[PDB]
Amino acid sequence: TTFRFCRDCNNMLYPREDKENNRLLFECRTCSYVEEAGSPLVYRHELITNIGETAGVVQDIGSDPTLPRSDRECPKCHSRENVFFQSQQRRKDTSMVLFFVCLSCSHIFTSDQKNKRTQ
Amino acid sequence: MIVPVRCFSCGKVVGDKWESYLNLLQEDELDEGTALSRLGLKRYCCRRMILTHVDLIEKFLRYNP
């Protein structure tokens, strides 16, 4: 989902069907504005979340003394200098998979062996 | 308060041996162990009597009346 608002209003856009042409539009309910939809996906629930997993990976993440270190070679620059956390999406069921951030290239890599990620 | 007359456990007179125990430490510069020994405080019951004593009297004397 993307969040678009009506110009000359900055008020939120509500969906409306152009039944005559079979196509989705977004009407402003504060004014007379309308725009064609970008994507047919309007609503999304996502019960099993994977967004929040690597929360707050600020470039200053390395400056955190509290954070632990590893000598694992990075998949990008093969630097033996990393920092790691696990959960960040603080849910009860969550796994203990470690998220490593390179103190050099700053690319995120998991310790996951079952799954095969990219971020 | 003030150096007890005689060791509690065995009754050996430790009351006289105070002033000399202070001299052995200050003047003679001996250690607390050899001082008690030179004074003739053989068994540890008497040793504790002098070694662990606090002569508070000196602090009470300081108050005017």
Add this chain to the structure above:
Amino acid sequence: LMSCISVGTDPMPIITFLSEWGMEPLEDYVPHQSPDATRVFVNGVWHGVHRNPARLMETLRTLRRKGDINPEVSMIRDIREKELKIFTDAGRVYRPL
């Protein structure tokens, strides 16, 4: 034995010092413009934002260490949360390290 209690300081020399070291007032905040922006908090008041907290910290941290900011004043930087909490506050139990 080592514990003490924060007696109460004045936050005004810290609010003054902050704006003269990179603090953008909250009235001029544009969230889409400064998204990584580190939120500055003095005695639980969001006073504004700062773009390079690392350099602001090094300065505040040593200012207090020199004795310029009172040593009972608390300064925390939760990097993950993009926040900088300061306390001139009275009540806090402190210990020496």
Add this chain to the structure above:
Amino acid sequence: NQEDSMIMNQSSIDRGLFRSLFFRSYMDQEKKYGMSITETFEKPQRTNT
């Protein structure tokens, strides 16, 4: 000395072992009930009621 109780050397107690002092302070005042009507610290005796 059974069940968290103990035996003490009396010959030691005699010599002044674990011996302590004790003090208690009792206090009083000559309360003034109204005007010129005052209480008086004295050795009283059988005088009326």
Add this chain to the structure above:
Amino acid sequence: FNQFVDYTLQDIICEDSTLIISFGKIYVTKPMVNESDGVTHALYPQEARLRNLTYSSGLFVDVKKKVFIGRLPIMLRSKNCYLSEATESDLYKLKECPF
């Protein structure tokens, strides 16, 4: 206590001061005893302890259009207390314990 007497106390006076009559600088005297058979004299801790009096000092504020406000009990060994400055020999003299 030292942060309260030095600062906080002046602050309480200046916040609800002025009326329809304003308040200025507050002065905190040393501990005294305003008793009859005499007028006033300095009260030392040991005395107060024995004579069951309050070891408190006078509070004076300058009223605009000086004035006695009341008596603030002083904490022993605090800024405004007598012992604060006193030496070991001073305390032994003052019948007060150095410890």
Add this chain to the structure above:
Amino acid sequence: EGLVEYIDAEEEESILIAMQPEDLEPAEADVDPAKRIRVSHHATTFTHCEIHPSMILGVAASIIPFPDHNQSPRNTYQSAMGKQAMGVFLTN
């Protein structure tokens, strides 16, 4: 001189602390069986050092001899009897 700093629980959250200085400072390139089993100084991120671990204790517990050799509530009990005790409370 900035050799020593004051830290509250809120600030403690953003620091790492070394227990002993020495025992928690160089690195590895025999041991006494009688001594206790201590951990390590593998952290190179150390921001502060504890003056002495025994300063976690208050007045009452500070009088207990070898309290690291007693079952914890037993220590909490002697923390209350130290009050039902006797001696000189002052010299005056």
Add this chain to the structure above:
Amino acid sequence: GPTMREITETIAEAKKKVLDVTKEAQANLLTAKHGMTLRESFEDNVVRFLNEARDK
């Protein structure tokens, strides 16, 4: 003395037995027990070894 060596060793081997389970659960391999989180199950095994150890 030799019994203290044996004890030190029993705690040491139980310490490594925990690490093996800690790194196992960090690579998502560790299959969760029925009606239990991967964490609930990881901890159960950890608290078990650390008690087995103390008991032995």
Add this chain to the structure above:
Amino acid sequence: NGAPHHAIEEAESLLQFHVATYMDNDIAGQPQALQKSGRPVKSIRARLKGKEGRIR
């Protein structure tokens, strides 16, 4: 005497209070009938109310 009638219902409510508050002072959401001192006044209910009351 000279009954203002909407003042009779004021002194009536006062007698109704005192007689109620003599028997029970620890009344459900109402002001405790305080004694001069600021003390609440022991009701008769309060006297027999267990753990230390007549009964218990």
Add this chain to the structure above:
Amino acid sequence: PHFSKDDYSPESKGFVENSYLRGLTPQEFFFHAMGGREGLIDTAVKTAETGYIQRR
């Protein structure tokens, strides 16, 4: 604070490696004291609760 973040080790979550003879480390001291306290609370609560139970 003496530990790094996301540390699940025996040493970090409260395992006491030492005997009462060898004596506890500062980490071991506090963790034992934490668990020890829970005991005195529970005890103090358990007496109150059983108090009522016996009487009813």
Add this chain to the structure above:
Amino acid sequence: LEPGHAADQEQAKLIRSAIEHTTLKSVTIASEIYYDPDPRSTVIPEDEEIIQLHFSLQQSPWLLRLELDRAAMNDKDLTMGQVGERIKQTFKNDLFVIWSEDNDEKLIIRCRVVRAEEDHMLKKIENTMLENITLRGVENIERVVMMKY
């Protein structure tokens, strides 16, 4: 267990499966409301195969796509058809239901309404799907354990 079943773990495994309360919510990864106006064509290229088959051997232009988890389905030993027929029997002749097979790389269920202000109607049906629908097992009977007493 029943008299002549005590030793058999498989008999037990069956009853455990027959009483353990499973909801639609437990197997669902995401609930999506798409705008697919042609019942015969799909804006989603994945679902292009699924339509062909559940159209061989009038509808709303609003799609409600549910993605179910393979592992979740496997711990609670479920089939896409099982799940399907359950959604099918909940709304009866008011919701047109299509679904991918247990082989298809992505597990999906497509739902279109039957026969102004319709998009808001699907948000209601999506909660009645997760929160209301009971898949298998007796209600309240949440975690069922196997014990060799």
Add this chain to the structure above:
Amino acid sequence: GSRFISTLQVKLYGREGSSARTIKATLPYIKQDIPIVIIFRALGIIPDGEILEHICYDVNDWQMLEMLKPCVEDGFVIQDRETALDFIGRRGTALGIKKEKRIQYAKDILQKEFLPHITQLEGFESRKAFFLGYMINRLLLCALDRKDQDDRDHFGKKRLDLAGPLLAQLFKTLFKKLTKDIFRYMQRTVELAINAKTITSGLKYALATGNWGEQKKAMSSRAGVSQVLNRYTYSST
């Protein structure tokens, strides 16, 4: 100074898996809960997209935004600053029709009783609405299972009122009663002599009884503040 603890809640109505998950807030002297959005309009932030921007600082964070779609609709019925202050005004009570009453009542609440730290000065809406948004953001983070629900027992979030703050509490209550004593002598002036005792004795009472409350009528007032120094051992002291 002042000493008036007014508490503000930002409630997320509707549980896990319940349609219409609306965010409403508890404003002082306002009998009912008000939707977040109305408060934003009453604060000046009128377009629902600028209101959004004060809560979610990222536009990529769709998850937090879908969560605010209901809130927008809840408030959609009010569209300007005046409508929002009147709505809040009507929820406060007093049947005061309209402008100089209803609206001016709400204005006062948002300046004096709403987020009373920050500032209580007139023009500071940009500050109080940005702060309201910080709370909504923190609320959602937890409802989206990202931030762990705040620990009530973290010692760093606790303070210990010592010998000073405790006397500060009395002295302020005592001097403000003395100010009221003075104001009664000036009123009586149909046309010096101020009760010194009130302050002297007030402090004496409290430090004796251990009842941190004026002055014989100390119930409900904190009992056990001032106890007599334990003097058995030098350690026990």
